[PDB]
Write a protein that binds this ligand. Structure first.
Ligand code: HEM
Ligand code: HEM
Lengths: 145, 145
């Protein structure tokens, strides 16, 4: 159950999550766009799922693309603000889960964001330790899918 | 025009939005739910627009309500973090506007949030001045609908 996954995150994991976010979270626009671009380069099989953002090949030049990147970056903020409160975290996750459930975004498909995240983290000098911690947070969302 | 409305966010209004947000921003969950409850009490003809939310009359108790309440509060935060860059502000508003357009929410309906906000602000000791400043920000989204 979602609650089980949320209550999982330990003090160590929660600490590493906030520690890294403090950086990658400082530039949601610059960092958010990078994550989206990376996911499009490594996972070209997900480009059609964003036919709304038009030509994701534009990057920062794409108005729609930027909107999603910036908006997506904020989505993570909400999860990073409800780490000390499983009750709240679950409610927040379940909400965002609805939008993903209607988009036919299976748990496996959602796990595709792990590749890009790890890259964006390494670019800042965040070894796996941090990459693994982020994976745990992502799992919480998959549990609701 | 979105570009026109956003151009109404002078330095004075920008400062007022941040000065107030700092307070109401401290409690997105507590304040978020309050805004929703006040909106459902002052505007009953807007309850059917949240069928998925289930029983709103439940208040904080309702998990679905809190989830959308906390998430909604974050939406405002994103808009405040873009007050510096008009270009980015629009890209964010347009993105959120698309969600209201597909929901059948016209400028009129949306504008139904000015009442609650004004009430929530007063409870914190923020007269009109602040209530009006927020109206300008809300207007930007109203022009994208
Ligand atoms: C860190 C992980 C992720 C976060 C925080 C996230 C967050 C978001 C948010 C906040 C939205 C807007 C929801 C709406 O307004 O309906 C969204 C939309 C969307 N996301 Fe998830 N997402 C993530 C991963 C993914 C992945 C891995 C995929 C696909 C493989 C995906 C596919 C989509 C699509 C297709 C949309 C709709 C875009 C549009 O048409 O506006 N996302 N995402
Ligand atoms: C400050 C003003 C508001 C903000 C920042 C805001 C923000 C949000 C956000 C971020 C969402 C989630 C979008 C998604 O995942 O699709 C949402 C959903 C929604 N909003 Fe707006 N909203 C505002 C005012 C209103 C008003 C006044 C109405 C109706 C009169 C409204 C109707 C809805 C509905 C029906 C949903 C979908 C709820 C659900 O089924 O989960 N919103 N809002």
């Amino acid at each position: 159950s979602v609650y089980d996954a949320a209550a999982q995150l330990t003090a160590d994991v929660k600490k590493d999550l906030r520690d890294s976010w403090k950086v990658i979270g400082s530039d949601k626009k610059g960092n958010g766009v990078a994550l989206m671009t990376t996911l499009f380069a490594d996972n070209q099989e997900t480009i059609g799922y964003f036919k709304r953002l038009g030509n994701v090949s534009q990057g920062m030049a794409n108005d729609k693309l930027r909107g999603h990147s910036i908006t997506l970056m904020y989505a993570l903020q909400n999860f990073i603000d409800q780490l000390d409160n499983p009750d709240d975290l679950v409610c927040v996750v379940e909400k965002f889960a609805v939008n993903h459930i209607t988009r036919k975004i299976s748990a496996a498909e959602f796990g595709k964001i792990n590749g890009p995240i790890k890259k964006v983290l390494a670019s800042k000098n965040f070894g796996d330790k941090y990459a693994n911690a982020w994976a745990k947070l992502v799992a919480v969302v998959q549990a609701a899918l």
